[PDB]
Design a protein around this ligand. Structure first.
Ligand SMILES: Nc1nc2c(ncn2[C@@H]2O[C@H](COP(=O)(O)OP(=O)(O)CP(=O)(O)O)[C@@H](O)[C@H]2O)c(=O)[nH]1
Ligand SMILES: [Mg+2]
Length: 414
């Protein structure tokens, strides 16, 4: 008698490369997130992976084994069904070096986070530190550190690394962050991770008063090949809602929208449409709340949505007043040292005329610095950015050693 509702919380899974993120998400949800051919062939995550599962508890059994991801208490004794707590979803971020820009985007969609640390690898490491301080910046401080691959190391070594993690987090915003030893591959001590999720990653408060805003991270064409032009389904736009709620048959718009070429001149025109369908995985719904990753059916030509073309864009109501800016002011603060790089090196102050990478919401855009002050910089963006609210958290990256590395953050001023 478990209800078929949408996920109510987004838990991001971040960490260094090949530490077992996707295998962990599979160990919990039973689903392999990587569905693209490229990432299945290369054996990594390239685009944000998604997977969801129900969470329940057999309140007549002993925790943490009392927790289940399916409506059955046969594994603990009683034949009655467990108490449905909530449905959760995971955002599986890539742990690769040159995919940081993706992770940041995913971080805009996270309510809580899990940081995967390999027990068979030394601590700390590049993308570990980087994703850590990134989560600190974004505001995803509902964190759980997971000691994966614990089955290949002795308890002495596991505790040895544990001490190092506690030392590392000692004196930071993550000082009291829990550390849970699991084995994603062989499914060892997963129940404790479920329990930890329920304890430390609670479902946030959603103020439905705020205007409906969705951050787009994917878009595609559900039309199977050779489909005649009369049976062509509308374009589908996928992403996460950060505030408010969307309903079917609602008038919406995509910002900045569509790139337009007029004899070499480039502009951007908002994409107006109507929600034809809303789904969360295989289940279809009439509403769409924050938490989970929603597929929004539109009346758009599939040509516009094909191949994640609307990535980074946002979706609001048609009559919403939203500034789409080519130039933005940012009240910034820089990091002290470049955390992503393998070599320890400090970060130069923002130079005029310098080109930077800005992560605003789910959008990554390059821009040239036009004004430099102690607390504020002004940037001329190569492409427009939709700024739905005031004080939007942005992430500032600079190209170092040929690769874009995070150097600091800021808030978008309007
Ligand atoms: N022994 C052991 N091996 C594991 C565990 N988890 C993952 N692995 C191994 O790591 C390999 C890749 O793990 P994967 O889950 O893809 O790591 P990832 O971090 O998602 C890859 P990327 O960071 O590039 O997106 C797998 O072949 C698997 O054998 C674990 O808990 N124990
Ligand atoms: Mg992966």
């Amino acid at each position: 008698a478990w209800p078929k509702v949408q996920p109510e919380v987004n838990i991001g899974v971040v960490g260094h490369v090949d530490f077992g993120k996707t295998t962990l998400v599979q160990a919990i949800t039973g689903i392999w997130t990587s569905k693209h051919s490229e990432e299945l062939k290369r054996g990594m995550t390239i685009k944000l992976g998604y997977a969801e599962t129900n969470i329940g508890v057999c309140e007549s059994c002993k925790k943490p084994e009392a927790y289940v991801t399916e409506p059955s208490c046969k594994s603990c004794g009683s034949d009655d069904e467990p108490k449905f707590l909530r449905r959760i979803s995971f955002i599986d971020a890539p742990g690769h070096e040159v995919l940081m820009a993706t992770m940041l985007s995913g971080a805009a969609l996270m309510d809580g986070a899990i940081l995967v640390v390999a027990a068979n690898e030394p601590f700390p490491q590049p993308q570990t530190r980087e994703h850590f301080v990134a989560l600190g910046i974004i505001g995803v401080k509902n964190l759980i550190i997971v000691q994966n691959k614990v089955a290949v190391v002795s308890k002495e070594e596991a505790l040895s690394q544990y001490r190092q993690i506690k030392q590392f987090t000692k004196g930071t915003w993550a000082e009291n962050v829990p550390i849970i030893p699991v084995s994603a591959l062989h499914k060892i001590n997963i129940d404790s991770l479920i329990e930890g999720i329920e304890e430390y990653i609670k479902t946030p408060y959603r103020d439905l008063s705020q205007k409906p805003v969705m951050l787009v991270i994917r878009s595609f064409d559900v039309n199977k090949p050779g489909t005649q032009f009369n049976e062509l389904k509308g374009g589908v736009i996928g992403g996460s809602i950060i505030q408010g709620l969307f309903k079917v048959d609602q008038e919406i718009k995509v910002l900045p929208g569509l790139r337009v070429e007029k004899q070499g001149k480039v502009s951007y025109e908002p994409i107006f449409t109507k929600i034809s369908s809303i789904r969360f995985g295989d289940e279809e719904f009439k509403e769409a709340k924050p938490g989970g990753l929603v597929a929004i059916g539109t009346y758009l030509d599939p040509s516009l949505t094909k191949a994640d073309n609307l990535l980074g864009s946002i979706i609001t109501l048609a009559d919403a007043e939203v500034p789409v800016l080519w130039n933005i002011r940012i009240k910034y603060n820089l990091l002290e040292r470049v955390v992503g790089a393998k070599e320890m090196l400090k970060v130069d102050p923002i130079r005029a005329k310098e080109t930077l990478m800005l992560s605003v919401g789910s959008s990554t855009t390059l821009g040239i610095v036009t004004s430099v002050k102690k607390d504020e910089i002004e940037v001329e963006l190569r492409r427009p950015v939709a700024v739905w609210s005031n004080n939007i958290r942005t992430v500032i990256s600079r190209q170092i050693a040929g690769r874009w590395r995070m150097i600091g953050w800021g808030l978008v001023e309007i």
